[PDB]
Ligand binder design. Sequence first.
Ligand code: I2X
Ligand code: I2X
Length: 179
Amino acid sequence: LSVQDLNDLLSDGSGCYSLPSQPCNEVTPRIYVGNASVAQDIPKLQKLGITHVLNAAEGRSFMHVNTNANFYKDSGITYLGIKANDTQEFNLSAYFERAADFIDQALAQKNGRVLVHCREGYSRSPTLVIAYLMMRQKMDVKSALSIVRQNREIGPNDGFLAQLCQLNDRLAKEGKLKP
Ligand SMILES: Oc1cc(C(F)F)ncn1
Ligand SMILES: Oc1cc(C(F)F)ncn1
């Protein structure tokens, strides 16, 4: 397992990452990854059956989505904001546990559906979703990234990829990767 292996898995035959066709996708059952516009479109969110929104890019910058729990007050949607940045040096793994718990809590609900989003739905939000699949559904990093990629064109930055590899080794050694 290397970052290079994950880069390969994200590349088409031509050698290039792809780009999201849609504003969001269901990447695994009841887990959606998506962008700023779906997150701010409550009508769409209900048509999708969304009960929980995880903003993986909470903030005021151009690379952030400036929502909070209040935005969703009278919609009955449950919110969690994470102020993550999309850079190779940003420590997203510090957020994996709290993101994984929020997603587990949403899916524990019978008709629960969670949207994990950032601005483009390409790097932060898919990293959190992968790490969740590894830590709670016992999927190794290659199969977790493969399934998410099969359902949405994504490209986590190489820092995030490194952090998923580190996580993958820990889980492996802990015997936690066996579904
Ligand atoms: O039950 C499931 C299924 C999947 C997907 F891989 F099909 N992911 C997570 N939980
Ligand atoms: O948005 C997407 C992406 C893909 C991928 F497999 F290329 N398939 C279907 N819908």
